[PDB]
């Protein structure tokens, strides 16, 4: 039930509200992104962060912000600069870092 | 079958042999290549270049070589550098021009 948990939960909710289509909602598969598992080395998504919150696996806001950033940086590497994904990713990285301070 | 028709028919078989899988054989579609026609404005491939050869549409070597470099370029733009796809185009492009010199 913890206070770090309470803070993380609301940064998540807030962060996820910027992803209407839940492009960042779930793990990415190779079926929907050919090459992905061999170009992205450490997967991250909003569904996966939700669960590390629930299991007290974040100990600091620092750790949580790290994975968020690892999620946008995976999308901005894999997706071409012109896509809904690369754009969305860059937007939310800068704004979500703005939000958490 | 004009003299220009014989030269180009020769250059074509020579190029298309550098591409054992057929990556270039046929026109790409957005079905197989998501958002392809919202980046590449003037699409190209071997099968099209063969059909113009037949049709006598190429009035010189220079114009055949422009289609080749069009089809090579198109691929380096669409595809990511780390891909099988971009690498064959980039290889085949510089070889091609030399071979046809």
């Amino acid at each position: 039930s913890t206070p770090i948990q309470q803070l993380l939960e609301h940064f998540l909710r807030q962060l996820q509200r910027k992803d209407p289509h839940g492009f960042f909602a779930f793990p990415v598969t190779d079926a929907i992104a050919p090459g992905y598992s061999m170009i992205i080395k450490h997967p991250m998504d909003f569904g996966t962060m939700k669960d590390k919150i629930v299991a007290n696996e974040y100990k600091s806001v620092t750790e949580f912000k790290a994975d968020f950033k690892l999620m946008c940086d995976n999308a901005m590497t894999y997706n071409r600069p012109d896509t809904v994904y690369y754009k969305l990713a860059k937007k939310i990285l800068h704004a979500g870092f703005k939000m958490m301070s | 079958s004009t003299p220009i028709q014989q030269l180009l028919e020769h250059f074509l078989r020579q190029l298309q042999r550098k591409d054992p899988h057929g990556f270039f054989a046929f026109p790409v579609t957005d079905a197989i290549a998501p958002g392809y026609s919202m980046i590449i404005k003037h699409p190209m491939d071997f099968g099209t270049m063969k059909d113009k050869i037949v049709a006598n549409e190429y009035k010189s070597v220079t114009e055949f070589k422009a289609d080749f470099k069009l089809m090579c370029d198109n691929a380096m733009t669409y595809n990511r550098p780390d891909t099988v796809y971009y690498k064959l185009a980039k290889k085949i492009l510089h070889a091609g021009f030399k071979m046809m010199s």
């Binding site: 929907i32 992104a33 050919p34 090459g35 896509t83 | 790409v28 998501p34 990511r80 891909t83 796809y85």
Partner: peptide
Amino acid sequence: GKGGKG
């Protein structure tokens, strides 16, 4: 709608 050709 995501990715390259594969």
